[PDB]
Amino acid sequence: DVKLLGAWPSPFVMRPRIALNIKSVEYEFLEETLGSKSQLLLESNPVHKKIPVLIHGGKPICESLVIVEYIDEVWSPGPAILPSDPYDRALARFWAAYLDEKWFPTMRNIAAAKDEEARKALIDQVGEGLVLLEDAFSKCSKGKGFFGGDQIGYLDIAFGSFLGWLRAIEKMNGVKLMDETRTPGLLKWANSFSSHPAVKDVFPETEKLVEFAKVLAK
Ligand SMILES: N[C@@H](CCC(=O)N[C@@H](CS)C(=O)NCC(=O)O)C(=O)O
Secondary structure, eight states, rough: OEEEETTOOOOOHHHHHHHHHTTOOHHHHHOOOOTOHHHHHHTOOOOOOSOOEEEEOOOOSSSSSHHHHHHHHTTTTTTSSSSSSSHHHHHHHHHEEEEIIIHHHHHHHHHHHHHHHHHHHHHHHHHHHHHHHHEEEEHTTTSSSSSSSSSSHHHHHHOOOOOOOOOOOTTTTTTOOOTTTHHHHHHHHHHHHHHHHHHTTTTOHHHHHHHHHHHHHH
16 A cells, blocks of 8 residues: 655655664565666656655655655554654754755765865765764753664654765775764664664665675766
8 A cells, every 4th residue: 555666775764764774564566677767756756757756645745854754654553753842853854954055964974075185075064064963962862862762763764764875985985974972872873773673774784785886886
């Protein structure tokens, strides 16, 4: 009754997936294949032609974050994904928004860098980006293990959905962007997320993510 269109290595595809595992909503996973586009996609998401795409009642929903909020709402009876306080809720959205427009582009844009400089510059920001989210974690979690708190939340999805890749870009660049000193909470959090039940069977393997990068090469 629920169809999801994405691919094993898209962190955006992980977003509507985790959320579905939180509500216990089952779904059909319509894989896409590199370099091509299924007609069901070109059909269902004609504006961006991007994955993921949620299909619910014969209807399509687009933009991973919006799908997550829709999922939180259609299945309100289960564990709530977004926070509950109007302000707390707005915080999660600010950071998700920030992560999507600046943090991730910056971190992906690395590979494209060239002089070992720009490379550093990017990596530098990726660091500054983490120090903050380590700060946001500090208030957001109140000594609990997730942005959401005791349990997995909206901000854990958005930001956690990138761990496989960040773990992968680390390896392929001989750099560790999280460390005991500067982000000791996230280091701990990044391993209480990629192990969470709603994540552990939808989280890609760093290595597999590394073959795929080495493949997106050309
Ligand atoms: N920003 C979109 C997804 C961003 C995006 O670029 N998605 C990629 C996956 S990494 C995609 O759809 N690629 C093109 C395709 O093959 O359809 C969202 O937040 O839902």
